[PDB]
Every structure is written in structure tokens, then in C-alpha cells.
Amino acid sequence: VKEFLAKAKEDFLKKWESPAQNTAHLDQFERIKTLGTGSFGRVMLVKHKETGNHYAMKILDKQKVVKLKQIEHTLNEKRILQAVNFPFLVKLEFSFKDNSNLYMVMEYVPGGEMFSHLRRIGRFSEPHARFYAAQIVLTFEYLHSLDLIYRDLKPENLLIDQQGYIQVTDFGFAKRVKGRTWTLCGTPEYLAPEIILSKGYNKAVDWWALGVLIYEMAAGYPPFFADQPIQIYEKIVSGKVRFPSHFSSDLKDLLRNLLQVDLTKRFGNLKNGVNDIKNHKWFATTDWIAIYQRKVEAPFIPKFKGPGDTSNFDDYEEEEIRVSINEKCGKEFSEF
Amino acid sequence: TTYADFIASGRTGRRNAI
């Protein structure tokens, strides 16, 4: 496992040190349909002429990014994405910029968001939630081993691929960092207490997040919810959580170690790192290697009657794309 | 039920980041 990780690190480091830039242009693609909206910008299904390949293109308006004070986070997102490599991470195929916009061309993942299936079906069975949760575990282990904090886990950001496996998308809040950082970002339902309390935090906020996610998948609703974020924060910070009476006792014990407001004893943050989680009883039947190799059979395989069909995604208002004749925000995004 | 409260709440859609 070490030689895996150790070698993963050397590869990321070389890419991180000298990122790829300008690997395409908007002309080489045809616009088909808007697939969704993430942290910032829009993502559209596109077709790559020269190859006939379908991709998902994230487009960000440079001026809007500057307005929201997201420049550094945006540069983070591309620099990190061009550098990582993992089965459960959506792959970035190219990136480029024009006078107006930043572009990030990613693998098209046709099964849609976990979000859509979860809400439609209600909640997942424990073995079902375990299969998903394992892939996130391995993914955070990869990411944290490179000093990366994900900071935006939610079912909206988890796509289901043709083999029924998960791919994580939207690195808008991802950051390579040693030790602590302070930005107030993420999704209210998923925020760790240390974050809402401006205490300063580290990668343990991600393991809390996995807690929220396992709960939401198993229950059909988040541990902390309410009409407004403000009420949501009061409940995250209060040291209390209720479990549906169908939750197995092991699952409850896991969740108690994950939604641990005490950084001291929060699972994932102890002496044994991720192994504390990997070894919990709830994961007793989880075959960590077979899952990394996708040899494990998925619970659910999405309807897919086209290489470029979009019915597993909701429809969105289709917004035109405007490319200035004048360059915008040149110096800000020079490294993009 | 907690599920009934969630389903009638304003946060069963796609949730934006802060």
C-alpha cells in the first residue's frame, strides 16, 4: 500500500510542480446540453469533434470569479485536478481559457448524481451505503496523503458511472495544505463544528463530512437539517445526534466516531489514521482491495441507452456563452 | 416523522455551497 501511495505522491508532485496548460480550445468542441451546477460555474455535456468523444465541460466566467473572491480557489481547483489520479476521482481531460471564461474538460459520467437516485429511492440499505462509503474512504486516503483537503463532500458531487461506481467531482474548495487553514466554505449540512466555530481546521473536517454522508445515504436525510443554515449550525455544534431506529448498532458506533466534535478522538484523526475507519466493524465485510479494483459488484447500474444520453441528469435553463472581444482578468488567471 | 419533516422542509433540493 505504501509503495502505491508513495508512488502516487511522486507522480502528483511532478504534475503539481509543473501543471499542464492550454491543452485545447473551445472550437474543438460542440455544445450539447447543460448537465448541472456545482460550487461555481456551469457544466455542459460536449462532443469533441476530432474524436467524437463526449465530455463534461465546466465553464467559469472570469469576471464573476473575481467578484466572488474565488480566484485562488479556482486556481487551486485546476492545478490540483490536473495533478491527481484515482479511480474514484473524475478525470480532467483538458483545460483552457479564453478572453472571458475558464474551461475544464472532464470525463463525462453518464449515470448522474448520487443525489438524484438517493432522493428518488428514499434511502440506501446499509450494504448499499457501505459500498459507496468505502470508495470515499479510499479517496480521502489518497487525497489526504497528498496534503489535500476536499471540503465539499455531498451526494450532489458524487457521480455514478457505467459500472455503478462513484466519481467525485467539483474541486472548487480543494486545497493543498500542511497543518490548518480557516476558510468558511462547504455546504451547511456537511460542515464540521470546528469550521462553523472559526477555530481553524485540517483534514479531519473531511472525515466528519463522511459521517454526514453515510448518515444521509442510510437515513434518506442528513443528521442536521432545518429551513435555514443558521438553525442547521446550531444543531451541528450542539453535541448531539439522533439515529433512525433502523440503523444497525455498528453503523451507529461508526457515526459516533465520525460525527465526533472532539478532534482528539474523531475517527480518521487518531494515531492510526484511516485504518481506524477501515477496520471498524461496520466495514467488516468490505474488501478494500477489490473495491479499489472495481472487482466488487455494484448495487445499482444506471439506465444508459446512449454514449451521450443525459436522462440521468435533470434539465437546466440553457444559458448562452459570451466570449468578449476583449481579454478579461488576464493577470489574475495567468497560471490557468 | 423525521422523514416527513425533512420532506416538507426547504432543503430537499440540490444544496448550494457557502
DSSP code for A181: B
**B17 with A189: Cβ contact below 8 A:** no
For chain B, how far is it from start to end, CA to CA, in angstroms? Answer: 29
Binding-site members of A are 35-43, 58, 107-113, 154-157
Instruction: For chain B, say whether A95 makes contact (Cβ under 8 Å).
Output: no
**A227 with B11: Cβ contact below 8 A:** yes
Q: Which of B2, B6, B17 sits opposite A185 (nearest CB)?
A: B17
Q: How far is CA A189 from CA A114, A155, A276, in A?
A: 16, 11, 24
Instruction: Locate all alpha helices (DSSP H) within chain A, ordered by sequence.
Output: 2-17, 62-67, 71-81, 114-121, 126-145, 193-196, 204-219, 229-237, 249-258, 275-278, 288-292
What distance in Å separates residue A144's CA from the closest CA in chain B?
Answer: 21
Name the residue type at position A292.
Y
**B2 with A188: Cβ contact below 8 A:** no
What's the 3-state SS for A289-310?
Answer: HHHHCCCCCCCCCCCCCCCCCC
- CA angle (A41 as vertex; A142, A132 as ends), nearest 5: 35
Residues of A serving a catalytic function are 152
Residues of B in contact with A213 (CB under 8 A): none
The SS3 assignment for A147 reads coil
Chain-centre distance of CA A68, in angstroms? 21
Rounded distance, CA A321 to CA A144, Å? 36
A19-112+304-334 has the same fold as A1-18+113-303: no
Binding-site members of A for ATP are 35-43, 58, 107-113, 154-157
Instruction: Locate all alpha helices (DSSP H) within chain B, ordered by sequence.
Output: 2-7
Q: Which of B9, B10, B12 sits opposite A119 (nearest CB)?
A: B12
**Assigned CATH class of A19-112+304-334:** alpha beta
Q: Which residue of A has its CA nearest to B5?
A: A226
Rounded distance, CA A194 to CA A180, Å? 11
Phi, psi of A173 (to 5 degrees): -110, 5
**Which is nearest to A236 in space by CA: A185, A183, A195?**
A195
- CA angle (A140 as vertex; A107, A174 as ends), nearest 5: 65
Please, which experimental method was used?
A: X-ray
What order do you get walking across the sheet with A42-48 strand by strand?
A: A29-37, A42-48, A53-61, A101-107, A92-97
- Other beta carbons less than 10 A from residue A210's beta carbon: 24
Which residue numbers of B have CB closer than 8 Å to A's CBs?
2-3, 6, 9-12, 14-18
Cβ–Cβ < 8 Å for A192, A232 = no
Residue A50 burial (10 A CB sphere; 0-12, 13-18, 19+): exposed
The full set of domain ranges for chain A reads 1-18+113-303, 19-112+304-334
**B15 with A225: Cβ contact below 8 A:** no
Give the three cell numbers for residue A92. 480532467
**Which is nearest to A259 in space by CA: A320, A302, A218?**
A218
Per CATH, the architecture of A1-18+113-303 is what?
Orthogonal Bundle (1.10)
Q: Which of B2, B11, B17 sits opposite A39 (nearest CB)?
A: B17
